[PDB]
Design a protein around this ligand. Structure first.
Ligand code: AGS
Ligand code: AGS
Ligand code: AGS
Ligand code: MG
Ligand code: MG
Ligand code: MG
Ligand code: ZN
Ligand code: ZN
Lengths: 232, 79, 563, 598
DNA sequence: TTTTTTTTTTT
């Protein structure tokens, strides 16, 4: 929806993945596809689909380099230094002066603790962080940076998002009358980070829908089509 | 009825909001007469204030961003 | 070349024809030769043979019926067309139908497997819908077209079936026949839908339902809201659009109420005083002559409720009902009284309602938070099969002439308390919708239970400030029982004793006279009088209306919901 | 392929021995099973198709690869080893064989087309079922000329018409008589993958299963099963008229075996006949453990061995797993009587409430877990959905009805707007639910038991206000509960030190089958009836409660509490198998009711 | 292109 004329409607295309390219792409995802562009069989007008030959995920804005993601000994050089923890801290959003300690915690949030399970009693291993502070201290800059430094990330604003649009919503299809589930922000950001600025301005009934995701890290829906617990 | 100035109403068919230009958009150069200047709907009175101010009505709501030139004359009677 | 003797069917036809004549009642006087007498005057075409007597007279037969009831039904009906030729006034092409009853063993709508098709079963359930009555073609008479002959006696099977062979060696159209329709044989056909009865529901389950097909003089026995007891055979039915897919259907032959309050046969004092068995009638008389009756129905209807002696009385007077009158102009006075209860938490409100709804027959029970407007009164549903909008009956309708028990009456929405007032006022229910225009009767009496605003009943305000009902509704009740939990201690011993007694002697310590089955009889009897008013009583009444207004008079005191 | 396999299977069925234990060496394992099949009804043999993996490996290749050309052989080869008991008892139907697997094999997302038509095991949570559907097996034709009735069988999977009357030869006169043929049953069920075992940030799938003749009604919506059955794929036609079928097939699963017995949860109420299937060696153990002077505190303290002390809450949550007696009040016209216990937990944050719900929900079978804002009024009890195919309104069950035998944990009890909170008033006190909507006028019922958890208003227990003001719940809802546990956070340094010392320990690193069987027993063969000495301590225990709760303004007492004491008292007697309620069983469940609000 | 029931955004 970025690369669309100022107020035009986005157009779709159909992709027939088959063979070995299946199960590569997840819904709600940035992707790049390579394949022939053919018309559909069975007057002279024709409807067309893309017949995929290659599918590459471009989430990171460049590519998926998980195969080449191995580090080099010349980088183990750095990682083995005395203060490797302190180089990264200074190399987080360098455009922002000061805040030597906040950048030390925004890194722990990206690394995350460990999570136990003794006698069947789960303990979460993620970290949550709030940034109460005066106006003009570059908080919506720090958040915009931590958005781009995460494999799975999401960005949301308190005043432009409703409490059912964060967790998960049940919506009907006027073509079939059937109610289906649709993940929210916290679901699409399952193994990653979610960012909510303007957090004091979110409506008070749309904010208690986070107490569930912050402790047990599930979302338990019991609306009138569905009864389940998604993992978030 | 619909009102004096424009409204945004949820159409039964479309299930979406549509725009209702009231009287002051139909009176082109004409004259509009009003009585009981405290009875008109609060929103409507706000909008007539702005319409006599600028001489046009511009609603920016759910799916409606248009402008209607109001060119008429107000002859009001108070109480 | 010639057809084959279906021996198991014809032998059974023969033995049944014999049974019809030989079997006699307690005094000789063959009984199926006198019930088969009225079978000649028009509109009667079903003989009702009891099945237990066919067990007496024979037993190698019952096991053939109860196992081949579909093979041998087309013969147990011809063997009634011969047995009734001894009257000579029946139209020769008229046809009759046998209808069994009183089977020994019952079943449940969930025991109707697919190992039961073609047998003889018996089912009990409620009734949800009733479609209209139709004709159905059982045996068409195809007027041949080229031969101008008449191909005759061709049986249809769920379709038109267009038999295609002629007995004429020159039949130019083995694919074209215009059937006549003034000689062919039609039978009525109604199709209703029944729903699993209440006492069979496995816990935590939604009730199933099936289609039953009444197909005879039995065509409007079952109505919506009743609890009939059907007895026929389970059959399979194709999907005629592609003539596969099959679906089960019950093909009933007899239908009768599940528990007759009067076991004679099933409307004034004498018609009922006929069915009263000797003990029944010597007991009803004894009660009607009893003194202090008005205190032995309370003590015998609500045996586990200590106190509130002024609420049980009102509930009784609600059950008996007043006299319904119709003014000459065309209006109508309401005959039955409505009653509302309002009280503190845990004061036995829902217990009166549960008692009444389990005692009374044809009385429905609904909560307020889990209802609707179009669910109480009446709905409109698109049957795409008929592709038409038809009317569905609501809780205020399938409880007609009974009692509707509404619990938590003040939780209902603002717009759902409007439809109920439109019914409580005129005693009718109007419908004006997509393509439907109708006015339905509703002569129910309502028993409603509510809660004061903010938990407790505040005894320094009028009623209109303690409850959130509308203004019109509070006028249509005319009996209120405000209950309060006066913080006392002599009661808190009595109630304690009674509850612990009930819980220690679970089925005993209940010593009511006039067992519950008996009171239903007395109440079905005594609800057929229309008492009148003597002049002295009329004078008394007007004087009492005089003495009631002025209590509300100014100065000395004050009261709520002004008279 | 056929004769070569029964000979290799009979051997397995005869000579097999396992290093295992069953029903709490008796070499003839499957011969003992086959003997039990003879001493009772139920002609099904539950074979584990992994035992056949130890004894062999060339049938275990042919059972999970050609299952429909093998399982008939596995029936025949069992009918003959039934020779021992042939003359003794002669049942009628036949003997059966049902392979299965203790552990799952695949997910619902990794079913690939190299697995079409071969044994497969998945697991899920049944959502909804359907009504029976007939299915033809033996046709029955009849001529219009010769009136002669032949009966052709369906062999390959289709029915062929003869087209020649064996007598008259009119070359097509044989109509099909429907209601004289033979049918069998067929039900359609829908699974739904469990929340565990699914990928990152995705929504559950569903899979359609088809049951058959005898498995036709052996499962209910709301159950967690391990279905095992073949995996098939059948074509579909673009028109219901032409024979132009599509090229993308459509798959389902022809189920062969269910399994609802999971190890970690208690015994569901399908195993009440199975309680008579207890080793008499075990009833001694239970009856003897039930004699120690504190078996109450010894079983309670074995719930959730990760919470810190909280000694009373575990007492309450243990009495909730037994419940009062199930008395039969149909005679007194009163109606029915609730026998399960509803528990409310209120208290300031960090006090480990949600952990207790998360622990119980994982213990009891047939349970649910709900939350505050993610549950509506109708989603908890019963909704009405436009059925997609038939275009008709049909009823469905919510969460408080799917539990129905178990516990319905409702976390975040405060944050439910008063609309959806006033719905619990019916289902939690009368054990019923009366629905009156468009075309549906019915009355369900259930045997659930809520276990709710809330926070005080302001989320901080400020001791300036009164107890009936930190909770901020009405009275017509607080009285339907009978154990309102007020947890609090006192600032005793000793307590904080002990708790921290306990919590850190969770980072380094009694039995169950005693409790898991003690509970089944104490449910099956116990019915405490009150006494006259107990009944005389129950009257005063309610006449004092009134004077106490009246003044303080904490929580008033209505006669409903006097029933709860019963519910609690009896539930205590069941713990020790006492079969009779005496005095102490009232003092205990009175001290419990009093010392929870302080 | 109509009712009725249920969820979520909007004036
Ligand atoms: N220490 C800093 N280093 C770099 N840029 C800064 C610094 N302080 C302020 N800025 C800049 O000042 C602007 C601050 O805007 P934001 O980042 O939106 O402020 P904010 O913290 O979001 O304030 P609120 O919460 O939205 S009022 C940006 O252009 C920042 O780049
Ligand atoms: N006067 C009484 N005599 C005998 N039992 C009583 C009496 N009052 C209450 N009870 C018992 O206490 C319970 C009362 O609960 P209900 O009557 O169901 O509730 P209710 O009166 O409808 O109040 P709410 O508003 O709905 S909580 C039942 O178990 C009754 O048996
Ligand atoms: N007594 C205790 N025993 C064991 N763990 C405890 C105890 N008290 C606190 N905890 C731990 O502290 C945390 C408390 O979290 P919860 O159990 O979710 O509290 P809670 O009652 O859900 O809080 P709120 O009111 O809902 S925010 C968990 O990590 C528990 O493991
Ligand atoms: Mg900002
Ligand atoms: Mg009540
Ligand atoms: Mg919590
Ligand atoms: Zn002809
Ligand atoms: Zn023939």
């Amino acid at each position: 929806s970025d690369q669309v004329p100022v107020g035009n409607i986005p157009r779709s295309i159909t992709v027939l993945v088959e063979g070995e390219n299946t199960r590569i792409a997840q819904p709600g995802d940035h992707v790049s596809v390579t394949g022939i562009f053919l018309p559909i069989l069975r007057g002279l007008l024709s409807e067309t689909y893309l017949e995929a030959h290659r599918i590459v995920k471009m989430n990171k804005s460049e590519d998926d380099e998980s195969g080449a993601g191995e580090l080099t000994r010349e980088e183990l050089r750095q990682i083995a230094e005395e203060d490797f923890y302190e180089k990264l801290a200074a190399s987080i959003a360098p455009e922002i002066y000061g805040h030597e300690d906040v950048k030390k915690a925004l890194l722990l949030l990206l690394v995350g603790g460990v999570d136990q399970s003794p006698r069947g009693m789960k303990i979460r291993g993620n970290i949550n962080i709030c940034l109460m502070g005066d106006p003009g201290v570059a908080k919506s800059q720090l958040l915009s940076y931590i958005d781009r430094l995460a494999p799975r990330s999401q960005y949301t604003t308190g005043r432009g998002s409703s409490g059912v649009g964060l967790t998960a919503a049940v919506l009907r299809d006027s073509v079939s009358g059937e109610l289906t589930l649709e993940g929210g922000a916290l679901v699409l950001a399952d193994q990653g980070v979610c960012c909510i600025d303007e957090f004091d301005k979110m409506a008070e009934a749309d904010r208690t829908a986070i107490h569930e995701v912050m402790e047990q890290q599930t979302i338990s829906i019991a609306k009138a089509g569905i009864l389940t617990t998604l993992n978030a | 009825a619909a009102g004096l100035t424009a409204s945004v109403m949820r159409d039964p068919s479309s299930r979406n909001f549509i725009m209702e230009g009231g009287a002051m958009v139909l009176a082109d150069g004409g004259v509009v007469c009003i009585d009981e200047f405290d009875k008109m709907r609060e929103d409507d009175r706000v909008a007539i204030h702005e319409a006599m101010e600028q001489q046009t009505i511009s609603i920016a709501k759910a799916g409606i961003t248009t402008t209607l030139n109001s060119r008429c004359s107000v002859l009001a009677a108070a109480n | 070349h010639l057809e084959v003797r279906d021996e198991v069917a014809e032998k059974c036809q023969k033995l049944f024809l014999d049974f019809l004549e030989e079997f006699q009642s307690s005094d000789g006087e063959i009984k199926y030769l006198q019930l088969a007498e009225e079978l000649i005057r028009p509109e009667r075409n079903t003989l009702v043979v009891s099945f237990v007597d066919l067990e007496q007279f024979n037993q190698q037969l019952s096991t053939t019926i109860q196992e081949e009831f579909y093979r041998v039904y087309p013969y147990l009906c011809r063997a009634l067309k011969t047995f009734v030729k001894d009257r000579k006034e029946i139209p020769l092409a008229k046809d009759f139908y046998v209808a069994f009853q009183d089977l020994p063993t019952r079943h449940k709508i969930r025991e109707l497997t697919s190992s039961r098709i073609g047998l003889l079963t018996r089912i009990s359930g409620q009734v949800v819908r009733t479609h209209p009555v139709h004709p159905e073609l059982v045996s068409g008479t195809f007027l041949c077209l080229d031969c101008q002959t008449v191909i005759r006696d061709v049986e249809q099977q769920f379709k038109y079936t267009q038999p295609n062979i002629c007995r004429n060696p020159v039949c130019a159209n083995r694919r074209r026949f215009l059937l006549d329709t003034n000689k062919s044989r039609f039978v009525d056909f109604q199709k209703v839908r029944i729903q699993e009865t209440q006492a069979e529901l496995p816990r935590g389950s939604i009730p199933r339902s099936l289609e039953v097909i009444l197909r005879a003089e039995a065509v409007e026995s079952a109505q919506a809201g009743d609890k009939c007891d059907f007895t026929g055979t389970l059959i399979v039915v194709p999907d005629v659009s592609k003539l596969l897919s099959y679906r089960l259907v019950f093909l009933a032959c007899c239908v009768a109420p599940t528990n007759p309050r009067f076991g004679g046969k099933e409307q004034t004092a004498e018609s009922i005083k006929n069915q009263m068995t000797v003990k029944e009638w010597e007991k009803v008389f004894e009660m009607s002559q009893d003194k202090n009756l008005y205190h032995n129905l309370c003590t015998s209807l609500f045996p586990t409720i200590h106190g509130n002696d002024e609420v049980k009385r009102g509930v009784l007077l609600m059950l008996f009902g007043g006299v319904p009158k119709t003014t000459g102009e065309g209006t109508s006075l309401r005959g039955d009284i409505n009653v509302c209860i309002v009280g503190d938490p845990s004061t036995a409100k829902s217990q009166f309602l549960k008692h009444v709804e389990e005692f009374s027959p044809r009385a429905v029970y609904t909560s307020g938070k889990a209802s609707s407007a179009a669910g109480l009164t009446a709905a409109v549903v698109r049957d795409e099969e008929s592709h038409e909008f038809v009317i569905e009956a609501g809780a205020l309708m399938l409880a007609d002439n009974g009692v509707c028990c509404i619990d938590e009456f003040d939780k209902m929405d603002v717009r759902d308390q409007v439809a109920i007032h439109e019914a409580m006022e005129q005693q009718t229910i109007s419908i004006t919708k997509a393509g439907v225009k109708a006015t339905l009767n509703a002569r129910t009496s309502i028993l409603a239970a509510a809660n004061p605003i903010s938990g407790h009943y505040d005894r320094s305000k009028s009623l209109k400030q303690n409850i959130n009902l509308s203004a019109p509704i509070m006028s249509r009740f005319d009996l209120f029982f405000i209950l309060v939990d006066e913080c006392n201690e002599v009661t808190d011993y009595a109630i304690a004793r009674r509850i612990v007694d009930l819980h220690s002697r679970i089925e005993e310590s209940i010593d009511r006279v006039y067992s519950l089955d008996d009171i239903r009889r007395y109440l079905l009897f005594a609800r057929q009088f229309k008492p009148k008013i003597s002049k002295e009583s009329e004078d008394f009444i007007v004087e009492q209306y005089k003495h009631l207004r002025q209590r509300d008079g100014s100065g000395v005191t004050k009261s709520s919901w002004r008279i | 392929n056929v004769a070569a396999c029964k000979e290799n299977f009979q051997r397995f069925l005869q000579r097999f021995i396992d290093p295992l234990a069953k029903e709490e060496i008796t070499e003839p394992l499957y011969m003992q099973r086959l003997g039990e099949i003879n001493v009772i009804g139920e002609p099904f043999l539950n074979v584990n198709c992994e035992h056949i993996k130890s004894f062999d490996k060339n049938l275990y290749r042919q059972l999970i690869s050609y299952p429909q050309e093998v399982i008939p052989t596995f029936d025949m080869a069992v009918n003959e080893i039934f020779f021992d008991r042939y003359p003794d008892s002669i049942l009628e139907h036949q003997i059966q064989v049902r392979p299965f697997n203790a552990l799952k094999t695949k997910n619902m997302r990794n079913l690939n087309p190299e697995d079409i038509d071969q044994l497969i095991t998945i697991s899920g949570m049944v959502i909804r079922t359907s009504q029976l559907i007939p299915e033809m097996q033996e046709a029955f034709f009849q001529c219009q000329v010769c009136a002669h009735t032949t009966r052709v069988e369906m062999d390959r999977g289709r029915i062929a018409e003869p087209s020649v009357c064996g007598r008259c030869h009119t070359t097509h006169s044989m109509a099909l008589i429907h209601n004289r043929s033979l049918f069998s049953d067929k039900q359609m069920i829908k699974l739904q993958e469990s929340p565990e075992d699914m990928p990152a940030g995705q929504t559950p799938h569903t899979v359609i299963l088809f049951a058959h003749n005898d498995l036709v009604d052996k499962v209910q919506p709301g159950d967690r099963v391990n279905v095992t059955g073949i995996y098939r794929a059948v074509p579909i036609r673009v028109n219901p008229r032409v024979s132009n079928v599509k090229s993308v097939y459509k798959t389902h699963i022809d189920v062969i075996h269910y399994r609802k017995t999971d190890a970690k949860r208690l015994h569901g109420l399908d195993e009440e006949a199975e309680q008579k299937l207890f080793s008499e060696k075990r009833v001694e153990l239970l009856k003897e453990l039930s004699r120690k002077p504190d078996i109450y505190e010894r079983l309670a303290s074995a719930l959730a061995p990760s919470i810190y002390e909280h000694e009373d809450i575990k007492k309450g949550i243990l009495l909730q797993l037994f419940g009062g007696t199930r008395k039969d009040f149909s005679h007194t016209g009163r109606g029915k009587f609730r026998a399960e216990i509803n528990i409310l937990l209120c208290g300031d944050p960090g006090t480990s409430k949600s952990q207790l719900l998360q622990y119980v929900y994982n213990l009891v079978p047939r349970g649910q877990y709900t939350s505050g804002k993610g549950s509506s009024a109708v989603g908890l009890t019963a909704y009405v959905m436009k059925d997609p195919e038939t275009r008709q309104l049909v009823l469905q069950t919510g969460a408080l009805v799917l539990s129905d035998n178990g516990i319905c944990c409702i976390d975040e009890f405060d944050k439910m707007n008063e609309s959806t909170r006033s719905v619990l008033h019916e289902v939690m006190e009368q054990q019923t639910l009366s629905i009156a909507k468009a075309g549906i006028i019915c009355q369900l019922n259930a045997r659930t038991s809520v276990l709710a958890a809330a926070n005080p208003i302001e989320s901080q227990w400020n001791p300036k206000k009164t107890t009936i003001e930190n909770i901020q719940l009405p009275h017509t809802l607080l009285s339907r509960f009978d154990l309102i546990f007020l947890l609090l956070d006192p600032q005793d340094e000793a307590y904080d030190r002990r708790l921290a010392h306990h919590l850190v320990a969770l980072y380094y690193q009694l039995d169950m089958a005693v409790l898991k069987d003690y509970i089944a027993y104490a449910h099956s063969t116990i019915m405490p009836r009150l006494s006259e000495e107990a009944s005389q301590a129950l009257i005063e225990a309610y006449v004092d409660m009134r004077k106490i709760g009246s003044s303080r303004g904490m929580v008033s007492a209505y006669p409903r509490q006097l029933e709860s004491l019963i519910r609690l008292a009896e539930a205590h007697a069941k713990v020790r198998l006492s079969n009779k309620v005496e005095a102490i069983d009232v003092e205990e469940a009175k001290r419990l009711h009093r010392e929870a609000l302080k």
